[PDB]
Design a binder for this molecule. Structure first.
Ligand SMILES: Nc1ncnc2c1ncn2[C@@H]1O[C@H](COP(=O)(O)OP(=O)(O)OP(=O)(O)O)[C@@H](O)[C@H]1O
Ligand SMILES: C/C1=C/C(=O)O[C@@H]2C[C@@H](CC[C@H](C)/C=C\CC1)O[C@@](O)([C@@H]1CSC(=O)N1)C2
Ligand SMILES: [Mg+2]
Lengths: 357, 28
């Protein structure tokens, strides 16, 4: 039999079979009330759409059950009782939530076995590492997660409620300042597309701003669904600059470069070196051209000159969490780590705490 | 060799208790 891997994001579900190079199912994490994912969107003007996962944490369990059902039966076309299933969770996911995921997998879906891994840990594993610090940033939440020998270090984890959806909202705001108007849910989707296709991170923000002066060499045109053509200029890099300057959207938080530094500085002196040399980026919001080079530059400025800095950001990093799960679930020596149905029946949902770490 | 090497790095993984004893693993 084959293991399943499901990475349930605030924005997108990534699901597929262990051993595959990529998730075969990638679809919106929405339920419309009934309808799930891409079917829900197409039927939006009759159903009422909702995101069951908020900032990486499951908040609507009845809708989450719908997502998992749709994942097994409609996307993957499997019987869940025939497949061990690896799920993912956010750093700092509450104990009760892990228990509820476990209870549902065994009691509702009758999986023969399951496991739940921290998303950032899987990102690290996908790069062939067990020690490093991961910047994982998706649609709903961003974390800095230092990890030593597979263990996320809870006291040093940084959570930031600034991610992809927030960047989309900010881009709507600043494009609206240039004379355009993006306000509705439908219009937000257009702006998400603009963001994904045209935004980038400047190496030197102030210099890039000054460049948007000397010229229009940074300007791109974008055709709207109604055929109107708009022009985007310094918004291309002002949008993700917010990750380095959260004050752009009024947040008091330090930017992702400083929170990376702060996270490392909370860790044991003798592992700091290993964290600096193994900075892995994962998630859709790390996909901006220029982001790795900018992180390299900002971390170098904060760190001792004695420190070797390495940013690891592979082309496939949008899916590194899923890919890490695919690798882990396919390991021969991982088979002893699954929670089996037998162990569950004997121990109940709390089994997840002693098996999944 | 991700799978193999990761298997090896995961093979000799320490326990939570011994990372705690070494002041590496701490509660929030
Ligand atoms: N090429 C890109 N450039 C910038 N942003 C992108 C790009 N591709 C995807 N994104 C953004 O990434 C976000 C979703 O990515 P991802 O699937 O990693 O999030 P998620 O796993 O669902 O969320 P989370 O981990 O926060 O719960 C969206 O906001 C999306 O617009
Ligand atoms: C194209 C693909 C992108 C994605 O990231 O989609 C996810 C999930 C999606 C759910 C609603 C949307 C209407 C469904 C289809 C979009 C799915 O909302 C997001 O777009 C939200 C709204 S805009 C913001 O950037 N993230 C992200
Ligand atoms: Mg994610």
């Amino acid at each position: 039999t084959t293991a399943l891997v499901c990475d349930n994001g605030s924005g997108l579900v990534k699901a597929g079979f262990a051993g595959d190079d990529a998730p075969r199912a990638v679809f919106p994490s929405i339920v419309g009330r009934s309808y799930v994912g891409d079917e829900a969107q197409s039927k939006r003007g009759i159903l009422t759409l909702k995101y069951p996962i908020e900032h990486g944490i499951i908040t609507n369990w009845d809708d989450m059950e719908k997502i998992w059902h749709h994942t097994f039966y409609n996307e993957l076309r499997v019987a869940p009782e025939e497949h061990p299933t690896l799920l993912t969770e956010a750093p700092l996911n509450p104990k009760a939530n892990r228990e509820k995921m476990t209870q549902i997998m065994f009691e509702t879906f009758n999986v023969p076995a399951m496991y739940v891994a921290i998303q950032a840990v899987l990102s690290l594993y996908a790069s062939g590492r067990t020690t490093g610090i991961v910047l994982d940033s998706g649609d709903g939440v961003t974390h800095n997660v230092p990890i030593y020998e597979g263990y996320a270090l809870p006291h040093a984890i940084m959570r930031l409620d600034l991610a992809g959806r927030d960047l989309t909202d900010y881009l709507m705001k600043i494009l609206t300042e240039r004379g355009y108007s993006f306000v509705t849910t439908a219009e937000r989707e257009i702006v998400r597309d603009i963001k994904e296709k045209l935004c980038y991170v400047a190496l030197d923000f102030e210099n890039e701003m000054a460049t948007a002066a000397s010229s229009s060499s940074l300007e791109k045109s974008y055709e709207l669904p109604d055929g109107q053509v708009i022009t985007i200029g310094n918004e291309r890099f002002r949008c993700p600059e917010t990750l380095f300057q959260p004050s752009f959207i009024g947040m008091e938080s330090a930017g992702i470069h400083e929170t990376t530094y702060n996270s490392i500085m909370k860790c044991d002196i003798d592992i700091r070196k290993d964290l600096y040399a193994n900075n892995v980026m994962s998630g859709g919001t790390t996909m901006y051209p220029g982001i790795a080079d900018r992180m390299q530059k900002e971390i170098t400025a904060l760190a001792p000159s004695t420190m070797k800095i390495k940013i690891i950001a592979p082309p496939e990093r949008k899916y590194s969490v899923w890919i890490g799960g695919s690798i882990l679930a396919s390991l021969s020596t991982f088979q002893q780590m699954w929670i089996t149905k037998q162990e569950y029946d004997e121990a109940g949902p709390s089994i997840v705490h002693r098996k999944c770490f | 060799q991700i799978g193999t090497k990761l298997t090896r790095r995961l093979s000799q993984r320490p326990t939570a208790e011994e990372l705690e004893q070494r002041n590496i693993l701490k509660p929030r």
